[PDB]
Amino acid sequence: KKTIVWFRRDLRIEDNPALAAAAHEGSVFPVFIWCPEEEGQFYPGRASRWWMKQSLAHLSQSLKALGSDLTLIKTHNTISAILDCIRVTGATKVVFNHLYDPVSLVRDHTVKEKLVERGISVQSYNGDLLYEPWEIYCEKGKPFTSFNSYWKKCLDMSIESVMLPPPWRLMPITAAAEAIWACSIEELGLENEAEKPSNALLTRAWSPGWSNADKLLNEFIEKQLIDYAKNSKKVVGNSTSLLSPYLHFGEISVRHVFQCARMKQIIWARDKNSEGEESADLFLRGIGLREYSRYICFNFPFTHEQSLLSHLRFFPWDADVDKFKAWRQGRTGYPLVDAGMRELWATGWMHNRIRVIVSSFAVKFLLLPAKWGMKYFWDTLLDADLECDILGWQYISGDNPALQGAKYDPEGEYIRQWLPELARLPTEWIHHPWDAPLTVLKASGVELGTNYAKPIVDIDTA
Amino acid sequence: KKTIVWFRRDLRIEDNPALAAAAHEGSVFPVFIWCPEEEGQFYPGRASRWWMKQSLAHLSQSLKALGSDLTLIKTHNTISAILDCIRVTGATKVVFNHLYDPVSLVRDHTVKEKLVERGISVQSYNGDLLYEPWEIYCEKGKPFTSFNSYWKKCLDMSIESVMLPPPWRLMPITAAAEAIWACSIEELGLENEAEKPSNALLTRAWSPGWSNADKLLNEFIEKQLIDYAKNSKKVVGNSTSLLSPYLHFGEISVRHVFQCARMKQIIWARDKNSEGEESADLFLRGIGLREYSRYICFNFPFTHEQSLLSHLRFFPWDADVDKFKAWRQGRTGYPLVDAGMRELWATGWMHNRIRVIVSSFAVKFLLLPAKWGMKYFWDTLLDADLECDILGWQYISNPALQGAKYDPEGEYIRQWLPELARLPTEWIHHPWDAPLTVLKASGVELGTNYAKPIVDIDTA
Amino acid sequence: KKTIVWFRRDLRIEDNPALAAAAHEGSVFPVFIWCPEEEGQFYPGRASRWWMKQSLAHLSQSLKALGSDLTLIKTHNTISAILDCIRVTGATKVVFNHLYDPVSLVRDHTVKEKLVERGISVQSYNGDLLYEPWEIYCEKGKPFTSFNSYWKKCLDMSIESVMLPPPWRLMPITAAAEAIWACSIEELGLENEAEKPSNALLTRAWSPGWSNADKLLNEFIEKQLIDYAKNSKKVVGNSTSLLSPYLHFGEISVRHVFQCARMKQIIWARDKNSEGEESADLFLRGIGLREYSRYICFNFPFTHEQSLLSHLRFFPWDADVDKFKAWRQGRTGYPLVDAGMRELWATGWMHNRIRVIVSSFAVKFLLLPAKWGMKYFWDTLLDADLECDILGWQYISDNPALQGAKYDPEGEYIRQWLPELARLPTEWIHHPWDAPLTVLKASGVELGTNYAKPIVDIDT
Amino acid sequence: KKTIVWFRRDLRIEDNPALAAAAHEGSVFPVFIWCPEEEGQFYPGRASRWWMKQSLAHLSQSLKALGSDLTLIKTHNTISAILDCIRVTGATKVVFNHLYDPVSLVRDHTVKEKLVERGISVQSYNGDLLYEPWEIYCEKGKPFTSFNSYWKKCLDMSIESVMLPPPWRLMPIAEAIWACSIEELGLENEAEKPSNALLTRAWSPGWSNADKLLNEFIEKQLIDYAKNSKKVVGNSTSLLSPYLHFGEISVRHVFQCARMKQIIWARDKNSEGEESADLFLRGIGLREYSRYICFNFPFTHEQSLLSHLRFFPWDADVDKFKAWRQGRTGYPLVDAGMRELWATGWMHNRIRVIVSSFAVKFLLLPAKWGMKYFWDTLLDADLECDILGWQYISDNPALQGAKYDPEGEYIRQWLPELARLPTEWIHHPWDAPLTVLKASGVELGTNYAKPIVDID
Numbered sequence A: 001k002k003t004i005v006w007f008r009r010d011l012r013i014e015d016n017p018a019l020a021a022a023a024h025e026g027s028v029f030p031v032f033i034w035c036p037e038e039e040g041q042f043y044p045g046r047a048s049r050w051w052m053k054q055s056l057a058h059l060s061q062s063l064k065a066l067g068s069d070l071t072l073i074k075t076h077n078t079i080s081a082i083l084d085c086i087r088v089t090g091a092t093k094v095v096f097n098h099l100y101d102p103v104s105l106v107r108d109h110t111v112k113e114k115l116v117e118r119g120i121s122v123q124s125y126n127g128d129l130l131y132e133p134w135e136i137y138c139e140k141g142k143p144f145t146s147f148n149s150y151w152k153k154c155l156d157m158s159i160e161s162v163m164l165p166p167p168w169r170l171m172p173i174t175a176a177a178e179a180i181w182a183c184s185i186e187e188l189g190l191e192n193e194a195e196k197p198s199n200a201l202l203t204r205a206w207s208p209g210w211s212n213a214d215k216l217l218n219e220f221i222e223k224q225l226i227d228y229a230k231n232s233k234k235v236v237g238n239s240t241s242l243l244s245p246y247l248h249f250g251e252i253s254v255r256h257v258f259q260c261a262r263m264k265q266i267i268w269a270r271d272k273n274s275e276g277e278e279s280a281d282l283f284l285r286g287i288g289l290r291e292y293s294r295y296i297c298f299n300f301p302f303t304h305e306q307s308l309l310s311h312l313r314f315f316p317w318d319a320d321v322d323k324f325k326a327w328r329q330g331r332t333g334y335p336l337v338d339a340g341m342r343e344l345w346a347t348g349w350m351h352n353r354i355r356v357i358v359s360s361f362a363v364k365f366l367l368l369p370a371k372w373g374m375k376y377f378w379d380t381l382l383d384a385d386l387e388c389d390i391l392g393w394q395y396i397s398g399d400n401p402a403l404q405g406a407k408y409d410p411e412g413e414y415i416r417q418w419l420p421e422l423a424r425l426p427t428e429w430i431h432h433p434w435d436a437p438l439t440v441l442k443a444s445g446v447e448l449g450t451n452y453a454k455p456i457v458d459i460d461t462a
Numbered sequence B: 001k002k003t004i005v006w007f008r009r010d011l012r013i014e015d016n017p018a019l020a021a022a023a024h025e026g027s028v029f030p031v032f033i034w035c036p037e038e039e040g041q042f043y044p045g046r047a048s049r050w051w052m053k054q055s056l057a058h059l060s061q062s063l064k065a066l067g068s069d070l071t072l073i074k075t076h077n078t079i080s081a082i083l084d085c086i087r088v089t090g091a092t093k094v095v096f097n098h099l100y101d102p103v104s105l106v107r108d109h110t111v112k113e114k115l116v117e118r119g120i121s122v123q124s125y126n127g128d129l130l131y132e133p134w135e136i137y138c139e140k141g142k143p144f145t146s147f148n149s150y151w152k153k154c155l156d157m158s159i160e161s162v163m164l165p166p167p168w169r170l171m172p173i174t175a176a177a178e179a180i181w182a183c184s185i186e187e188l189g190l191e192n193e194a195e196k197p198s199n200a201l202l203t204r205a206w207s208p209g210w211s212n213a214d215k216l217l218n219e220f221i222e223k224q225l226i227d228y229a230k231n232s233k234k235v236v237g238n239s240t241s242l243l244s245p246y247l248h249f250g251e252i253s254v255r256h257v258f259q260c261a262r263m264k265q266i267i268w269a270r271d272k273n274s275e276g277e278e279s280a281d282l283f284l285r286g287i288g289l290r291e292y293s294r295y296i297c298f299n300f301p302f303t304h305e306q307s308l309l310s311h312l313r314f315f316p317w318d319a320d321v322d323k324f325k326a327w328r329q330g331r332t333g334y335p336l337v338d339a340g341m342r343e344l345w346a347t348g349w350m351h352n353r354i355r356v357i358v359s360s361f362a363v364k365f366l367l368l369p370a371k372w373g374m375k376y377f378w379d380t381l382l383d384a385d386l387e388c389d390i391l392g393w394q395y396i397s398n399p400a401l402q403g404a405k406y407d408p409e410g411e412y413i414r415q416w417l418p419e420l421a422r423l424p425t426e427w428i429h430h431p432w433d434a435p436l437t438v439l440k441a442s443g444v445e446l447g448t449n450y451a452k453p454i455v456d457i458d459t460a
Numbered sequence C: 001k002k003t004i005v006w007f008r009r010d011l012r013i014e015d016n017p018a019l020a021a022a023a024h025e026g027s028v029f030p031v032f033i034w035c036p037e038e039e040g041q042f043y044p045g046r047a048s049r050w051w052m053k054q055s056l057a058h059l060s061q062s063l064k065a066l067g068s069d070l071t072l073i074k075t076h077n078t079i080s081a082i083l084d085c086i087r088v089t090g091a092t093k094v095v096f097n098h099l100y101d102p103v104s105l106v107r108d109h110t111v112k113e114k115l116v117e118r119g120i121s122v123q124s125y126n127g128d129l130l131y132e133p134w135e136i137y138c139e140k141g142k143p144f145t146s147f148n149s150y151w152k153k154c155l156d157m158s159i160e161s162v163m164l165p166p167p168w169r170l171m172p173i174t175a176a177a178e179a180i181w182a183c184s185i186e187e188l189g190l191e192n193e194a195e196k197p198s199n200a201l202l203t204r205a206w207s208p209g210w211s212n213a214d215k216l217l218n219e220f221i222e223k224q225l226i227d228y229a230k231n232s233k234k235v236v237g238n239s240t241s242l243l244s245p246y247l248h249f250g251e252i253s254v255r256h257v258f259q260c261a262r263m264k265q266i267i268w269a270r271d272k273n274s275e276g277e278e279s280a281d282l283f284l285r286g287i288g289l290r291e292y293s294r295y296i297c298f299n300f301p302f303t304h305e306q307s308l309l310s311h312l313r314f315f316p317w318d319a320d321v322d323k324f325k326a327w328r329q330g331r332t333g334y335p336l337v338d339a340g341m342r343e344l345w346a347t348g349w350m351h352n353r354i355r356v357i358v359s360s361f362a363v364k365f366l367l368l369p370a371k372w373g374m375k376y377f378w379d380t381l382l383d384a385d386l387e388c389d390i391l392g393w394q395y396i397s398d399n400p401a402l403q404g405a406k407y408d409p410e411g412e413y414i415r416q417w418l419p420e421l422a423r424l425p426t427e428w429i430h431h432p433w434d435a436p437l438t439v440l441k442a443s444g445v446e447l448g449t450n451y452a453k454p455i456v457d458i459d460t
Numbered sequence D: 001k002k003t004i005v006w007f008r009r010d011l012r013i014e015d016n017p018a019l020a021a022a023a024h025e026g027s028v029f030p031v032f033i034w035c036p037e038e039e040g041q042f043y044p045g046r047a048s049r050w051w052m053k054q055s056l057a058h059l060s061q062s063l064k065a066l067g068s069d070l071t072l073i074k075t076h077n078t079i080s081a082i083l084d085c086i087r088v089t090g091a092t093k094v095v096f097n098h099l100y101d102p103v104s105l106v107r108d109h110t111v112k113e114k115l116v117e118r119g120i121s122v123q124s125y126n127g128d129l130l131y132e133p134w135e136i137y138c139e140k141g142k143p144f145t146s147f148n149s150y151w152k153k154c155l156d157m158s159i160e161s162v163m164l165p166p167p168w169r170l171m172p173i174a175e176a177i178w179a180c181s182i183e184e185l186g187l188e189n190e191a192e193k194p195s196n197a198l199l200t201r202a203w204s205p206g207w208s209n210a211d212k213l214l215n216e217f218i219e220k221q222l223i224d225y226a227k228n229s230k231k232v233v234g235n236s237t238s239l240l241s242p243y244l245h246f247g248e249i250s251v252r253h254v255f256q257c258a259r260m261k262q263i264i265w266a267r268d269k270n271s272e273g274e275e276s277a278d279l280f281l282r283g284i285g286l287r288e289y290s291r292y293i294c295f296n297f298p299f300t301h302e303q304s305l306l307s308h309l310r311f312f313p314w315d316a317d318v319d320k321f322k323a324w325r326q327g328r329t330g331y332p333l334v335d336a337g338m339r340e341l342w343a344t345g346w347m348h349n350r351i352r353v354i355v356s357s358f359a360v361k362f363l364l365l366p367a368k369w370g371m372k373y374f375w376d377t378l379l380d381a382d383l384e385c386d387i388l389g390w391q392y393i394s395d396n397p398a399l400q401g402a403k404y405d406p407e408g409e410y411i412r413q414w415l416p417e418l419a420r421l422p423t424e425w426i427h428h429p430w431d432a433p434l435t436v437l438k439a440s441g442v443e444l445g446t447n448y449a450k451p452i453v454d455i456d
């Protein structure tokens, strides 16, 4: 009994329907493979690379308490290093968890069918979704189009796979020679040397590792799930889940956040505390958006499999740099649009709606190439998914700054935290200081120019 | 397409494997049967009757939120009433859970028989035990007999069940005709109006219902599981888990107690938190006693002699009434056993230490018969589970020595016997022999505001 | 220049105006004189004495942080005693505080007129009361007669006392070997020997020392004083302030608490929190009664000229000593009565509402001589003063079926002290002997075996 | 019987010996006079002028509960109105509290010189100090030279006054000439009204709040004053400066409870606390040294400046100074100053000396030219204390920034741009070699103003 477990994005030792199977047959030794030779343009971002650089030491320490080791390996020809350890340990099946980005379904399918050459087979599993992306059908076996009708379907199926248990103890493979070309994390070029501390001060407002995701989940529900309904439009403060980074990397089983959040939604329904019950629907509706991402990405091919889906690939964005240089620096001249970008670079996370503020501003007002923008988004955000992000820059494809600010920001407290220079305007007309009278600004300490960035462009022509 | 569940001691829906398994094949219809006289002498006790009357009503709301209603039949011909309720819907399935009491075992092999022979399908499930007591083997087909040997093997076979989720939208069928006599719990014979006002005062210390179980669990594991290894032996107040009733009635799925109490055990091991790693494995071994009862009842053969298997069937040695009239009134004299019985009579629960002190003195020194022993616990103890009771007495078949390891400061005796508010611990645990002056200066004159020790410990 | 500060019942450093006045002239060194040969019948009780022994030792450490050393002395005659201190110190002035009990006014009256013969200036300083018992008169200069006729007159006073700070550094003065006839505490003997191991169990519910006082008052006012209206008549739990013993021994200054609430009340006086405003008023009146007590004990006849009003020794007494030893052991039957004495004997303190029940008991429903009723209270109350206490046995000189719901609605007070009634329904606990047998036997209470019978019929 | 107490800078009813001194007698009538033209330059700034608005709104609502009333007289001339209200009410006493600033010193003496004509006696009471500087004459009348020399004699001679009780009853007793409302007594202008809105987030005036910050501070954080006082980060300071300035809390009562817990920790041998206490009462301490020099000599011995800073020429220009309140001085340790001081009206002491010392020693502006601006925006504008520190001044942005900002998170809280540099660089970005610059998000000149200075 010898089996290899290949790890991609399931760095958790609780509710893994790939790992959990392996503990039955016999001993194992896991494997992480990093091959930057095949990703083409889909190479990871700048801090997302940082993320994997951190949880690994957290995870690999975990097997040292369950009696084994995660054994990292770099290479170009993943098949060969697979062919290597197949030669050095004599296991027969290589279990693993599915992936759904279309830079992976080509990688998996080819390596498996080239793995039968040695009479070597494989069983793939589902360890990151609620429903299969091939389960939901219409009446005639077609793909849905409206998520709302989609969510009703998944909401009344109630069929899951299993919430498996955690294994008791691993069966460890002894060792092997050093002809696999890598042993330690540093040789993996996840993070460059010139930016090692500079890309490390995000550790104040973050702490990866599934051990952390457990603390953050339990502390979340009992404390502030009752107020998620009356906070999801509040951009200020930690007013939402903050479980975006963990989910993309598979550190907390989303089919576990679906139970431990479900078993509270029933309690308030029993007590008829309809306030708390109403907050639970938007949350679970939240996760359901994520299914709409991948399910479409598999039923339809991603963005038509080309540059963009059907219409926005050759739109004449102004072929200019400094505005694009200005869009990210935080000097566009607007309170909102410049607000978060001073914070995006600060901790690599923004509210879910503010992103939809900043996003539409560039392509629809600055007229800059989204490829220059989305690439920056992939370049900077922690949890920069491949599938949902391209969904994000489709709903943003098809806004008076005054009105939407008050609803999003009622009392002018957000801008005062990420733009301290404007801490002396009245709560009225703060979000659009260029519209107020000239003399009231003199009443404050805001003078556009040398002490505050004038607006790059205005809506009068925009 | 149509099924009829049948709850016996699984008053819970989160992880009810005999429940979700019915939700997928169509529609369901819950039921609860009461066995008034087919229990013979195994009629549940007084207090234990009360806990059920508070658990069901709370539970009846819970399934109501899911869109269904629990029905309640009271008869001594279970196969008959179940055979009647079948013809109201024509279901081909009747699910339940596996139980190992000597009276429902025989009740179960027949009900399937009268159903399989009559030909209507039925599935059982397992939802009360991690390991089924037929799985564990020693070499080929023999059982173990040393619990440490048993537990040493359970820690090395992780193959077990899979905790399901709770369903979403349950659909009953019709509930058409009440000819099955859909009796109400108030119409169900659970208590007596004469004694009813007294028993309701138990709510000052407990609150039944499965939903309260969860709010206690997270209240437990996140707060005091880290130091349970240094609070199990301190009899005073609330130290232990206080889960014993909720696990007897299936108020909470035991396995989920074994997940959320393991993940908080692997974290400390990774962190070198050597203290917490000790207190974790003195709780998960705590549950381990629980299975070991079940594994002796079924796979070891039952009491071939009377209920007490092969130890005490000849030497009761007494038929007194006044002594038994004195042992349960807290007028014994020993200021440790007295502090218990008033604790039991006041809240219907004791700590595991005291449950082995009031017993040992109840037989080794008071000369009373064992049979009188078990039933009095059997009538009042909230968590009176029979399998975990014969184990309680076969473990047993001066207090100052044992007065130190369990309660050193003597804080306990000054909570339930306030007459001794002015005695130091050097004489609180045995007043009969203290110096004559110390009793005078304190508010204790033997016999007048406290009775002497009922039997001399020194000789007998 | 050189002075001798005298400590009698004001063991505090903050706001001791007799001391701060001597914090300007020169060097000071404290003194505590003891003589158990001048009080005779006024010898403070058993639990009273332990308060001194557990407050002085707390005080002495506080004065040594400022460069001083409280000396302690025994003597048969204080006059000859203090003259010894002149023998070595050779100081010049003498400052003390005023008292009002009938034993001190005679002694201290001799002190002034017997030290001027030695050409020694001597002063007093009234730092224990709010208003002088002699300054308040009627319009015609006669005294008042009734409390409420007096309290309104005391809410508009002009010539107030003064608040003081604590000095920084005290210049001590070392004279010679300690003294004649005595030592620190050993020869004064605040406690006998064998009584010591028992008394220490009082520390669980009290902690002497003025340093603990300030922690309490700040903890009491800004946390509990808002609800004093709704807790003044609830017997269970720490309803009232729990300040009585400190304010007797002067461990806190009465003119500092009275300020700390008035400045507090005016805050609520602005926001229209009358319910918070009104509860503040009762505590204010609570100080009014106590001050009222010192009034009539000075300008009205000395203890009314007798323990019984002037003679009051002829009416029916029927001295049956059996009940007395029967009463104070808490075995009388009336569960509220025996509730008290099982708290009075375990923490040396009761709620004042309770103290008017039992006090009515020993004389009315039992006919015992009142002097037997003081000898117990004086012997075990931790705040057994002389002046307010005589008021207690004078304010009195009612059916429990009613007042039971008056002061303990749900009956929590009985079940905390008497646990054997833990299974009566609440509407019967306050009077069991009216119960029907179908509920006594149905509960665990058998009148006459474990819980004593009524000592006497209520219609007697 | 009636007496006219005269509230000047003691807006509180607790421990006010200029008020309760009337209570022994009888009816009173409080009045508050303002004159925006007799103070000349000392016309209080925008910051302090706003603070006055809340307290009087808070005191008037306070005294009325005692069955009384407090008008709001305004005048062209102070001495005139008092004799005017005299005739209307016909009292015999006009008590008030002292103020030891020379601009108002002579004023009270001017009214002590006119009241003896009418034959109504006056009584001034000590309501701001533990030691009214007349008694502390040492060595027969030669004042001290340092502070600690001054702070020592008072200790061994620690005689004080008696903390007087609060009052119980205030039975009180036409147009007090051309009586004016609250808003005609202009403390604000029309424009600056809404901009004063956000300042409420930082403070909440009123004597009824001073006690809370007092009692909360004494029993919660006074242990950590010895270890937090040299930390710019967070709230590691009492923040009791304004509440103490306007007489909203009796300064001696603060010394009382402080000394109480001090000796308490001496009992339990908590040696760590006992240094936390003695350091703190030193904090109130040097305040007393301010008025001690301001009495025995007028401030700077005659005028606003001692005798010197008229030579030693300045960098006569405003575009330099125009940067300062704009907070573009390059050094984030300074530009973290103005961005706060502009937005809160308060700065920690240590930052205050590193910003104050800058304008004269590096920017080289006129010293008075910067002091005046502080009077406009610091919520604690006080001549007898502002001139103290400015006379206290007359280093390295990294060598000193290390003690008071170990992680720099104080800068990443007020300077949202620089949130991505290592802690050992964020005080002087120009030293960070270029490899750590473009990788980080800052390029000086566009993403952050270049330091307009030569560092040496």
Ligand SMILES: Cc1cc2nc3c(=O)[nH]c(=O)nc-3n(C[C@H](O)[C@H](O)[C@H](O)COP(=O)(O)OP(=O)(O)OC[C@H]3O[C@@H](n4cnc5c(N)ncnc54)[C@H](O)[C@@H]3O)c2cc1C
Binding pocket: B240, B241, B242, B243, B244, B245, B247, B248, B286, B287, B289, B290, B350, B351, B352, B353, B355, B356, B359, B377, B381, B383, B384, B385, B386, B388, B389, B391, B392, B393, B395
């Ligand atoms: C004479 C006698 C009779 C008893 N009768 C019962 C009975 O009817 N029902 C009952 O549940 N327990 C019985 N016990 C055991 C004991 O009362 C309980 O197991 C335990 O004290 C309950 O406290 P707890 O819930 O805090 O236990 P904790 O140890 O704090 O944790 C709760 C869990 O501990 C388990 N556990 C701990 N010790 C034992 C044990 N010795 N045997 C079985 N399970 C154990 C329980 O199953 C329960 O699920 C008896 C013991 C004796 C000596």
Ligand SMILES: Cc1cc2nc3c(=O)[nH]c(=O)nc-3n(C[C@H](O)[C@H](O)[C@H](O)COP(=O)(O)OP(=O)(O)OC[C@H]3O[C@@H](n4cnc5c(N)ncnc54)[C@H](O)[C@@H]3O)c2cc1C
Binding pocket: C240, C241, C242, C243, C244, C247, C248, C286, C287, C288, C289, C290, C291, C293, C350, C351, C352, C353, C355, C356, C359, C377, C381, C383, C384, C385, C388, C389, C391, C392, C393, C395
């Ligand atoms: C029969 C009888 C006997 C009493 N014997 C004593 C005694 O020996 N010693 C003693 O100190 N008090 C005695 N009292 C007064 C009162 O019962 C106690 O002071 C009791 O402690 C009041 O509760 P408290 O002080 O804890 O309430 P708190 O709120 O803690 O105290 C209120 C304050 O007001 C005073 N006070 C309140 N009510 C009264 C009152 N009716 N008379 C006098 N002062 C009052 C208390 O001394 C205290 O300073 C007696 C009262 C009665 C009716």
Ligand SMILES: Cc1cc2nc3c(=O)[nH]c(=O)nc-3n(C[C@H](O)[C@H](O)[C@H](O)COP(=O)(O)OP(=O)(O)OC[C@H]3O[C@@H](n4cnc5c(N)ncnc54)[C@H](O)[C@@H]3O)c2cc1C
Binding pocket: D237, D238, D239, D240, D241, D242, D244, D245, D283, D284, D285, D286, D287, D347, D348, D349, D352, D353, D356, D378, D380, D381, D382, D383, D385, D386, D387, D388, D389, D390, D392
């Ligand atoms: C150049 C300079 C000018 C200043 N101008 C003023 C001014 O106009 N108004 C003003 O109120 N304060 C002034 N200060 C004092 C200093 O600004 C205060 O410490 C700070 O503004 C408030 O902090 P704090 O009250 O919480 O200090 P804490 O120590 O927590 O407060 C204790 C109290 O002691 C006094 N105090 C504290 N530090 C000092 C100090 N360094 N010098 C004098 N007294 C002090 C204050 O009354 C303060 O409220 C000045 C200090 C300097 C160096």
